[PDB]
């Protein structure tokens, strides 16, 4: 009420020019020259900035606020996706930890580092569910499962904001992308999303909800159509659901030019009508295109919008700036004016031990034939592949203020680990792609892919020599970061062809072969799974990537990471995901069942799959009672044992099935998990509690109710577990 | 009244045992031995038969009806998909004609032939819209566009039934599959369908509606879930939409065991509860599984169903049998008991001139480099490929009572054409697949593909010899019919690997190359499009396939056929189709648009694409008026000229765009077309009439309304190349 009183007072004093100015979100570029945007903050025509990210630069613009009548402060935002200056695994990587704390840790440091440079807000977390591997931004998300993505969506918000949004070591979480962006048609970015309302509520919205429940201060609106309505103009989404059904009190922010793009969507004839549609749907902040500033004065002066529309928008900005504390101290995150200069990129502001301890948790052991891993630090080891010495690629897509040169490549990481106890032979082995059209694309803007000018065959001879000169080969292969990024959708899911040639040749030398994969999406790995001797999924593991990868290769860390997005046998099985419906004709032999004929059926690697240097056993699953009363809770009991001879971590998973329902329900749904560290011979009893809240689903009219009847409870170390116990709900 | 009085009388007379008996649709098998089901028709426990298809066999069972108390007659049904005994192109083939009367002709003869053998009903037409090329049953449909599929869906019903359903040369049309079956997830048959209701009404339902509007006597319910509800138990679909919104008076028929499959869908705990769900949703007839007969007596005796449920079902059967005339004369289609047994498969009952004149219309010219086609009948010609001499493959999937040996292969068709005026060299060149697992599948049940036991390399040397010995090669390559059928979903869209090797080799001999393709779905043809000198798409062209194909190869017919389903550049661009939404970031090149980076963008061949031995010109498009009044119609005027040097057919197509709408509308939609035969130098003015009815779409609340504003009118010879003019609706 103190806040409402303060805001109302200020708004009662503001001209319309000034209330509309508060909605203008810009960045420095050719669109907005810095010296023209400085003049505009002075005349009170700007509301916030993004992509300005250093203390002297934020201060230099904040310092313009004083020349304006109402002296209203800016906030600054940035794409703090998976790190500011120290870069953690890409989010898909982080998810594979199966540990909130680990994810939380990555978030806190990001905020710490961002706030340290003067940043008020991160456009993060990206929380979009993804079941189509072809999509360029699958990297940014946490995988295919609702339960886990929703869970981690909250953890990220809580960590960024903490308990006080005005704390100078806290940033506001602008959760994205609202909504359904990840279900785009054909995995083409920006493409049509068409979905039933029961699937919309059960599977794809819950993560956006959990961000509002954790108190996210802002929401970024997606670029996709929903059932034919662009989210930028979707009053159902931004008003009915977000505001009234969900009670979001915060700020809505447009995507980059998403308001003028209503012309290309075919919802507006021109800019004037695009502005109207967006402001009236529930869009507070207008990113970059400046439509709001050009058209809202004439839209109001001709009675096409209500003052109440401008007022709800302008009031949502000031409420953000107030919660951040920028009305108390505009410089609360920019230091005091005497304070001494410093180097922004100094090694002394990084958090390497953090980056390294996180990146360890997310690596996934896909194959290890006859205990080849872990490697000993003796003899000669060949390091071949175009990503071995790649700095720019390990820190993945959306790297923020991340610097390539400060990054530990997987070559350097191997050097650091062996010291002088073994020898490393390096050969590039292949460029990342043989296709010049693909190379032209990745280097259109900035040189981010190394092109070795030597013939492909030249590089291959060198590699085979190097391999014959070694005890075993370690192959650093897969995508450059520019391949799993915004607008970079793929029609193939295998390792690029130039590198698969390299892998065929290396296989032909008979020397044991270890595959180290870098990638921002699942990959088609049918060949590699039958040929190569061991495979490590390392995603893009960040600034301490190489170090974390070495630790796992040399057994300093027993890999514990597991898949949160099923691995297709080819681009032509898309989509596959663990929580599909059984259909009327399930494949279990049989020609006349739901299947392909021309390839094996199922995902290559199921959801929740990962190996360990040690072996684990689960005892028979016990349920407290076989009939549950309404309001009561149920207990699921199982003993996890490390029966191998190495201290290692697994992830014990709880799946539910509702086998008889008013809807057709998935064969399996994730409902809980416990990440457990055990010494050899060490047991550990795990306890799962199951309430009514766990048993609910959205029927045809969105009635969110548990139905009485049998339920199936599954406990195992991956979704490929197939034995359960049953209880009856009364 | 006569009918109502007759039915009411009979029903007032029937015990429950007998009214339930009327719902039992069975066929002869291990489920139902012939001599046990004979005993059952005598105790009045059977209602209809399917898959019994010869006069003596139908008579032998009809003849059992006399020993029953109420002497109620059976009807007999069969899968008359694209022919009974004379087999026309597969439906996708038929569609490519762009001529209703041609399609009508195929339908009439089918009915003629079917009724001749004693058949009352065909489970046809299949009318499901298909945008996913991987799906096994794409062959059965008419392609991806709503307007064209809806149009032909009615033509098929009208032709099967004629003007009188009791006529002994008419059958009843059971339209399928209701509903949305073709949008299955990942192209996997029987798999989940999830769709928004605005896209459901605009794009996928209209063809089922057009069949009810043409007076279809029956409707078959699909096996797919819709937004989580199995259609077999979907009261919204079978009662609200079908009965009360649409006013369907007729009969609903289950898919094969689709009622017991509600257990595997996860809607029912057991059979008893599956029966209840289905009978109460709107399912009259129970195909094969016999659940209705086992459970309806106890479901009614315990008040789980209403007598009104049994009565609505039993009344819908008798209404069908009455309309067919089987109460007037049970043998009206089974002759008088005087004639000789006669041979069913006699040459004198076929319709070859029909089959040949249809199959000509459906062939599509995809490429012709420097007028290589048409061929002269004047030298040596190599005929290579595993489908050149293939009888079983030309008559495609769902060939009914069709006989392979009566069919004209593409080899034989070429022999017939050249007589002794030119010389034919044959080499198989490759089996249809190199993969033994694929060959094992296609020959699981019946020997459908003859496998040459020689090594792949052996066959290839033979082919290259044959090719070197000739003036040019004609290659008969693509799918066996077992590859485009129910349950046969593909992960690849190219010609099988064994045959692509064969085509690379043949290309390498320098000899001019003609590709004759056989296939039941679009195919990935990027290589063939850049290499081969000409390509002909022949689908599976039926009993007179070879003859029709020769006629086109030797210029006896100028190819006029055009594509009704866009051709993907690879399985990884699925789905593509001409009537997609523009999105906010359209590509036509930028990086940040809705696209792939690792392949060229767009379909290989767009919807409505086909070439000709002659060339055609369209004059500037003229509109009747700049501004249309409500209730008024508009005229669209264009002059088509054959400016080439041969008499040929093209197809002039009318596309509409609504560029500003409450919904995001497709970039282009089909609204009309005119197939025009022209002599060289010969012109023809075409007139298109455009009403408000043409400009409607389903908004977010299913308001079927045209909005005032600009509309874009496009006329051209394919969805790709075009010119447009704009008009305003007031
Ligand atoms: O770069 C700022 C913003 O640009 C938008 O177009 C992207 O969709 C967002 O993920 C991003 O936060
Ligand atoms: O117009 C292109 C813009 O689109 C945004 O979504 C991208 O994230 C920006 O980096 C880019 O400048
Ligand atoms: O063959 C009888 C019927 O069986 C069903 O299960 C198929 O899906 C239909 O296509 C067919 O008409
Ligand atoms: O699965 C049993 C039956 O199902 C039908 O849909 C298929 O078309 C038949 O070939 C098969 O006999
Ligand atoms: Mg239940
Ligand atoms: Mg309009």
Short mmCIF file of C-alpha atoms and ligand atoms in Angstrom, two decimals, chain A residues 50 79 123 137 176-177 220 223 255-256 287 398 486, chain B residues 585, ligand 1:
data_model
loop_
_atom_site.label_atom_id
_atom_site.label_comp_id
_atom_site.label_asym_id
_atom_site.label_seq_id
_atom_site.Cartn_x
_atom_site.Cartn_y
_atom_site.Cartn_z
CA UNK A 50 19.33 -4.12 -22.38
CA UNK A 79 20.60 -12.36 -21.51
CA UNK A 123 15.80 -12.30 -19.58
CA UNK A 137 16.88 -23.34 -28.71
CA UNK A 176 10.43 -16.90 -20.98
CA UNK A 177 9.12 -17.72 -23.45
CA UNK A 220 8.68 -12.14 -21.74
CA UNK A 223 6.92 -14.80 -30.99
CA UNK A 255 10.13 -10.05 -27.78
CA UNK A 256 12.56 -8.15 -30.11
CA UNK A 287 11.45 -4.04 -27.04
CA UNK A 398 23.86 -17.34 -25.06
CA UNK A 486 18.13 -19.14 -32.07
CA UNK B 585 9.68 -13.88 -39.37
O1 LIG C 1 17.98 -10.45 -26.87
C1 LIG C 1 16.85 -10.13 -26.02
C2 LIG C 1 15.69 -11.06 -26.38
O2 LIG C 1 15.56 -11.18 -27.82
C3 LIG C 1 14.41 -11.98 -28.16
O3 LIG C 1 14.08 -11.91 -29.56
C4 LIG C 1 14.64 -13.45 -27.74
O4 LIG C 1 13.53 -14.30 -28.12
C5 LIG C 1 14.85 -13.50 -26.21
O5 LIG C 1 15.27 -14.80 -25.76
C6 LIG C 1 15.90 -12.46 -25.79
O6 LIG C 1 15.84 -12.40 -24.38
#
